[PDB]
Amino acid sequence: RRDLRVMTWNIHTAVAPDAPGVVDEPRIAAVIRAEAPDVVVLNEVHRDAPGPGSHGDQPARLAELLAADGYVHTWFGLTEVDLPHEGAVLPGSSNGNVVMSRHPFVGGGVVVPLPNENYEPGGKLRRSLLTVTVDVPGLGDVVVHATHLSTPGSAVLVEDQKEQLRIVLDHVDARVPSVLAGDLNIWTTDVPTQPYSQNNLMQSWIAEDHLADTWRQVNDPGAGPTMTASYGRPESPHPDRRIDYVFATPAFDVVAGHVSLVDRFASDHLGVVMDLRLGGAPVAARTVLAGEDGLDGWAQLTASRPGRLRLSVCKNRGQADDDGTAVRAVLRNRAGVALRTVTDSGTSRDRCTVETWRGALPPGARLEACLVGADGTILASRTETL
């Protein structure tokens, strides 16, 4: 069978917001055990030598706690050494991203450093990408990319987020089944209180690279903020604080997903648990961005055997308030006749519009993505032949 459950979680070094000063790997492990993912990506896992505030060897402890549950394949991808602990640099400390899996790796993990040149020219490394292939029974090889980007704490940090993301995306091959997961530290849309926010731009790059935001395919983004403290708060900006993601390549369909509420106060982030299903090899995958500068959303078309078509259309505009605009995708024949139209309205807090049907792309077909005004006027249009 073709199901895959993928979880991502920033575990805050297993220190719970409801119990400061206690390192509690069992609480983290119990949530993972209950969610029973095939593969889990963890951020903020330390591997520290002894000293004031040390977290010890967290990957080894998590592996010990989860071995009997089948998570016997683990990889730690170093991101940073010698971090402040309790107000002082702790020698021999380190942070990593971790992949844990019930299924064996093919080869080993590879770590790619991600720069912070704008924040600190010539400074220490702080962020990295971990890539490892997992051989999943029934599916075959799935490439897992695990990362954690800088926080958007300033204009220079956002410039670093952009450079980090470029490198991450250039390491994803959408031609093979892959997932990209972790704390990307970006909303899907520009933060209105930050003039230097460039989230719409970054999301357009991810979509151009044939990656689908899996949560947004099946759920309202506004129902899944991933900061624990934001969960359950309808007031702005809380429903927008979804910053932990699972992205998937076109071969995957998204079945369902949820934020983990087994023990919500175990970390200051919520775990994101996605149920995916691997289809056949895509025969075509194309993204057309929407809006005059390609910043208002997108349409992603996937064709696969036998004769299946999928169109995922996303309006990536607005937070609390719907301006009445819509993103519309039209599949047209060579004559320009509409074969199918799929539209997404609402705001970035609302689920994307995904349609799947039986059909074949005729020769000379093209895909159009438009931004449509509230009055029905076409504000922008972009078309690409297939």
Q: Which residues are annotated as a binding site for Zn(2+)?
A: 46, 48, 55, 85
Q: For residue 202, give the H/E element and its range.
A: helix 199-208
Q: How far apart are CB 89 and Zn ion at their closest, in Å?
A: 11
Q: How far apart are CB 23 and Zn ion at their closest, in Å?
A: 9
Between CA 187 and CA 178 the distance in angstroms is: 22
**DSSP category for residue 151:** P
Q: What character string, x for contact with Zn ion (CB under 5 A) and - otherwise, covers 52-91?
A: ---x------------------------------------
Q: How far apart are CB 183 and Zn ion at their closest, in Å?
A: 17
Q: How far apart are CB 87 and Zn ion at their closest, in Å?
A: 13
Closest CA to 129 of 175, 83, 96, 176: 96
Among 48, 213, 240, 344, binds Zn ion (CB under 5 A): 48
Residues touching Zn ion: how many (CB under 5 A)? 4
Task: Match 């506004």 to its residue by tokens.
Answer: 222
Beta carbons within 10 angstroms of residue 88's beta carbon: 10
Among 46, 61, 269, 366, binds Zn ion (CB under 5 A): 46
Q: How far apart are CB 54 and Zn ion at their closest, in Å?
A: 6
CA 254, distance to chain mean position in Å, is 13
Q: Is residue 319 within 8 Å of 189, Cβ to Cβ?
A: yes
- Applying CB under 5 A, the span of 50-58, 205-213, 238-246, 375-383 interacting with Zn ion comes to 50-58
Nearer to Zn ion, 45 or 354 (CB): 45
**DSSP category for residue 361:** P
Cα 322–184–205 angle (5° rounding)? 70
Q: How far apart are CB 12 and Zn ion at their closest, in Å?
A: 11
Nearer to Zn ion, 48 or 244 (CB): 48
Between CA 70 and CA 33 the distance in angstroms is: 9
Q: Report H helices in 17-110.
A: 25-35, 58-66
- Applying CB under 5 A, the span of 40-48, 183-191, 261-269, 368-376 interacting with Zn ion comes to 40-48
DSSP 218-279: HS-GGG---BGGGTT--STTGGG---EEEEE-TTEEEEEEEE--TTGGGSSB--EEEEEEE-
- Applying CB under 5 A, the span of 45-53, 219-227, 238-246, 296-304 interacting with Zn ion comes to 45-53
Nearer to Zn ion, 95 or 147 (CB): 95
Please give the residues from 80 up to 139 whose contact with Zn ion meets the rule CB under 5 A.
93
Nearer to Zn ion, 93 or 230 (CB): 93
* Residues near Zn ion, by CB under 5 A: 46, 48, 55, 93
